[PDB]
Design an enzyme around this catalytic site. Structure first.
Site, mmCIF file in Angstrom:
data_model
loop_
_atom_site.group_PDB
_atom_site.id
_atom_site.type_symbol
_atom_site.label_atom_id
_atom_site.label_comp_id
_atom_site.label_asym_id
_atom_site.label_seq_id
_atom_site.Cartn_x
_atom_site.Cartn_y
_atom_site.Cartn_z
ATOM 1 C CB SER A 41 -0.879 0.011 1.236
ATOM 2 O OG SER A 41 -2.157 0.511 0.956
ATOM 3 C CD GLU A 42 -0.807 4.745 -3.747
ATOM 4 O OE1 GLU A 42 -0.922 3.666 -4.370
ATOM 5 O OE2 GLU A 42 -1.276 5.829 -4.164
ATOM 6 C CG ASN A 43 -1.840 3.995 2.725
ATOM 7 O OD1 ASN A 43 -1.713 3.029 1.965
ATOM 8 N ND2 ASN A 43 -2.672 3.988 3.763
#
Lengths: 206, 226, 207, 230
Positions: A41-43
């Site tokens: 997840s890029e977060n």
């Protein structure tokens, strides 16, 4: 649409680190459950799990599409720069993205429609450059019958010549040296059918 | 001891035109109390650096009501409706990875660096491009700001922070790249209660620490299984 | 000799500062500030350096830049080498104290190399001279030959150009502004003329 | 997806003459003793080594100098090795001295997909020689290039079976940097725990960066200078 997701599921392999973009690509997670796969997840998370139980929800834990999620055993958290270091650094094996348009040169437009939908690119521009393999999955034509597989994109590009593979409800295309190639027909679709609904020039390999 | 009981102790000098770096991803890990102090006081013409603008009724969306933001640098507005075509707000859309690395560079004393991200898009317009090993990269500039407004889980009295889950995001980057960083936290412990090897952000980056009584921690999309 | 240097250098340490002490002379300054709230940074990834350990608390995984076994204070933090130097390069350290072989009138510093004699490397010295909010060099005023180490131009390879804010020797205290050097203090029992005599660099007398 | 190995050959077998290795550690603190030993015993040569230091005469990367296994080294300091300088003066080994913060960031850039970046460090010195220089915001910078390698050889405290690592104290140093910047990374650790045993928020290096995990039976952890009080 099930034909899209299922066909994309076959591109995942054991031991891969994979980033699923928002929209269609998130559905791919459900088709792969019997595999050893780490979803990023890029977060700032590695190891996305299943959606939680009602009441088990946690506001500090969400995917890039702002949905409440859980983590798998051996998951890790990090900051956004760490996150895009991982992506830009070429550590992600596979990025699956949706699109509004794909052209024969492997160009993807997925972030804006001028004076209509401006929302943003998010991390899509990083993903298209960093991922070892970039797969776009998408409906062949839109609501109104217009081909989204084009000679060149009419929408602002997310990337130029960044798409390795494209999967639609009609066919499967691969990209090598500015050339597009039809490698597969979806079940119950004819070569003629594809040639008709595709503006992009492509060489047929079946 | 950097602990304050009043946000005004930290934010009193923030004025119109100031550049503020705001942590959080969507509504996750947002400095609610700081954003709130600014909505009440009505600071205007702010330049804001945040990954998103929050949502219509919460987060950074709040400041849009009275139009306190003249310019915002962000990667995604997608969750927000009201959020431009008016021209009352300038929006510089930046790729999320570039935004993060710009901030990191700002905190790390690096003026500029190259990235492949954005090549051949509108993002490359007006930027230097260059080739390294057969690939093209564009030059991106560091971001710094007057105030970092960040959210974390827990702090010690020396400003050492730990974040929680995906709530971390941009937060530490905003602290490092900002002249004055204030962090709002859910827990404060005495120096020595946080293990040296468990600390996410060393207190050297934090000028002020504020314990909020209650964070709303709103969820945009609640998704559950079976 | 060193005593007057060290004790004068100690006066530059202020409550609440984050400080980096280079190897050699500068490390001695910590001993003059035993009870003070000051955070010492070690470039190898620690913030909050602390006393040498008691026998039995020796830990090989915990050392200062000088490869000495140490402890940490409460509220210490560990981090990696990029983070350490991000902290340094990014201007977060209030004070870096360094030794030197030569200092030029322009604020130039040479402390890492002597050609075909002393070659070790620069370690983090080059990073520190640019990043620290204030850079103080503390140095013996003349070499073992009785030759001046405070010069018009350095003869040795530079650690940095125009990086030195303040220079403390056994003779005097100098400050740097406008590529220009001011003598702002004489050490105890030292004469203006002794300094002029022992200094090659051109300077303004600001006593 | 089990990355655990009990024999370093399963990891390093493909390491060949002329390869580039990124090696963690600061002095003797946080060094990969077993991988180094492995290279020493196997006799690999013409190595390009990237490490902060060269260890000491009889230990660390230093033991590789005996058979003259290193052609070139990128480091910010040496100072402790007599045998080293002997080969340096003679010129049997090419030494590139790099500012420690530059070495660290070059590694960071290499792992993060950044080919080059600008730094104030080294401006107006020998380090600036042969490098592009720019002015930004009224200040002088030089262009530094990323560093990558074929193998990262790193040491850590614990790993889980996924390759998530935690380091301890100042042992961490350059170790995670060497991991991210290398094509193949081999981590040697004192303990290996089940997935789930390391808290996701306590993990220093995500397992995506670790290809192989090796548990050392005994690390010597030699101390260069033992200093105590009272």
């Amino acid at each position: 649409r099930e034909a899209i997701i299922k066909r994309a599921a076959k591109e995942l392999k054991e031991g891969m680190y994979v980033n699923l973009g928002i929209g269609l690509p998130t559905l791919v997670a459900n088709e792969v459950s019997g595999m050893n796969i780490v979803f990023q997840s890029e977060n700032g998370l590695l190891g996305i799990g299943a959606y939680p139980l009602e009441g088990s929800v946690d506001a500090d834990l969400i995917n890039a599409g702002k949905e409440t999620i859980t983590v798998v055993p051996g998951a890790s958290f990090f900051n956004s720069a760490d996150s895009f270091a991982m992506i830009r650094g070429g550590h992600i094996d596979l990025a699956i993205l949706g699109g509004m348009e794909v052209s024969q040169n492997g160009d993807l437009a997925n972030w804006m429609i001028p004076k209509k939908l401006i929302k943003g690119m998010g991390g899509a521009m990083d993903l298209v450059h960093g991922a070892k393999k970039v797969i776009v999955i998408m409906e062949h034509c839109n609501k109104y019958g217009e081909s989204k597989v084009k000679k060149e994109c009419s929408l602002p590009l997310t990337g130029k010549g960044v798409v390795h593979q494209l999967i639609t409800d009609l066919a499967v295309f691969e990209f090598s040296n500015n050339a597009m190639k039809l490698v597969e027909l979806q079940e119950g679709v004819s070569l003629d059918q594809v040639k008709e609904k595709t503006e992009a020039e492509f060489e047929v390999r079946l | 001891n950097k602990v304050i009981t009043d946000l005004d102790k930290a934010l009193s000098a923030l004025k119109d035109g100031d550049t503020i770096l705001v942590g959080g991803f969507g509504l996750c890990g947002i400095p609610e109390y700081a954003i709130d102090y600014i909505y009440k006081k009505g600071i205007k013409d702010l330049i804001v650096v945040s990954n998103n603008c929050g949502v219509d009724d919460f987060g950074l969306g709040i400041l849009l009501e009275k139009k306190q933001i003249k310019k915002i640098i962000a990667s995604y507005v997608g969750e927000n409706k009201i959020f431009m075509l008016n021209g009352e707000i300038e929006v510089v859309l930046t790729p999320q990875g570039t935004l993060a690395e710009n901030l990191h560079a700002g905190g790390a004393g690096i003026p500029a660096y190259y990235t492949p991200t954005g090549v051949g898009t509108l993002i490359a317009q007006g930027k230097e491009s260059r080739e390294f090993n057969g690939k093209e990269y564009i030059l991106e500039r560091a971001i710094t700001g007057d105030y970092g407004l960040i959210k974390a889980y827990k702090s010690d009295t020396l400003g050492n922070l730990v974040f929680r889950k995906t709530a971390r995001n941009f937060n530490p980057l905003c602290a490092m790249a900002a002249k004055i960083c204030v962090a709002e936290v859910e827990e404060i412990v005495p120096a020595g209660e946080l293990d040296p090897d468990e600390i996410h952000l060393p207190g050297i980056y934090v000028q002020h620490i504020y314990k909020g009584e209650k964070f709303e921690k709103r969820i945009e999309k609640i998704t559950t299984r079976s």
